[PDB]
Design a protein around this ligand. Structure first.
Ligand SMILES: [Ca+2]
Length: 278
């Protein structure tokens, strides 16, 4: 209430400080996040998992990750990773508090069945702890206990807070549509497919595909910080030049099958074996 206002205040001063101490770049993200937080502070509880609980979890997590950055190739390997995480935290804040104003209670998921699943399972809540989320999901899509779950957390919990927000669920269900085979799609595209690069930049995809330039049909697919919930495919055309496609709001496996049948997507990461997706 006033606890929230105070924690909002601490957060912004903490970000300004972290900025002094310094794509996706922390120099661009830090002040953007600080500005959004002042707008949030200015515009300002809900039930459990409402705007208040969300802010509390968000601010603790922002704090924890800020300490990790402050206490800092393999140094650059870990700064890059923290930088992606801050990008993710800025996007989540932006989606649930556009212009500082909480919209979590009426936020609309892009895929209709994902929408229905979330609102029927969580009601007005915009955020849920991993354990509850995993359990609720499991009533609809069997999640195997053990290591599968760890890989699934990494895919879904973008902000690495141990909580899944409605935004992260939206991102995940867009990427791995259609709903009826949700986890199966995730398993085929993100666990078992050598074409999958997770988060890359355009430049990194270019760099990666250089060694495949004399092999047209070589391709890869990646996620993008500033375009959460969509794919990009990098591929070698017959000319040997690296092009990028952004697939429509439609299943990735369909785009890849159609591109396999056209001769564009044949060699994931240069490799000869192209997984059967039929
Ligand atoms: Ca999270």
């Amino acid at each position: 209430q006033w606890e929230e206002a105070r924690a909002l205040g601490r957060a912004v001063r903490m970000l300004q400080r972290l900025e002094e101490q310094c794509p996706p770049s922390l120099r661009d993200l830090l002040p953007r996040t600080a500005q959004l937080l002042r707008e949030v502070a200015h515009s300002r509880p809900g039930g459990p998992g409402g705007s208040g609980d969300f802010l509390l979890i968000y601010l603790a997590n922002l704090e924890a990750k800020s300490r990790q950055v402050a206490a800092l190739s393999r140094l650059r390997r870990q700064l890059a990773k923290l930088a992606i995480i801050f990008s993710h935290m800025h996007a989540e804040l932006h989606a649930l508090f556009p212009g500082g104003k909480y919209c979590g209670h009426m936020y609309q998921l892009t895929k209709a069945p994902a929408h229905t699943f979330w609102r029927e399972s969580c009601g007005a809540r915009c955020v849920l702890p991993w354990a509850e989320f995993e359990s609720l999901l499991g009533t609809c899509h069997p999640v195997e206990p053990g290591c599968t779950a760890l890989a699934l957390r990494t895919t879904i919990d973008l902000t690495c807070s141990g909580h899944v927000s409605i935004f992260e669920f939206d991102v995940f269900t867009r990427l791995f549509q259609p709903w009826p085979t949700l986890l199966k799609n995730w398993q085929l595209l993100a666990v078992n497919h050598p074409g999958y690069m997770a988060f890359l930049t355009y430049d990194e995809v270019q760099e990666r595909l250089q060694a495949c330039r004399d092999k047209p049909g070589s391709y890869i697919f990646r996620l993008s910080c500033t375009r959460l919930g969509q794919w990009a495919i990098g591929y070698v055309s017959s000319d040997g030049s690296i092009l990028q496609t952004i697939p429509a709001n439609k299943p990735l496996s369909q785009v890849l099958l159609e591109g396999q049948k056209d001769g564009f997507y044949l060699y994931p990461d240069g490799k000869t074996h192209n997984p059967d997706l039929t």
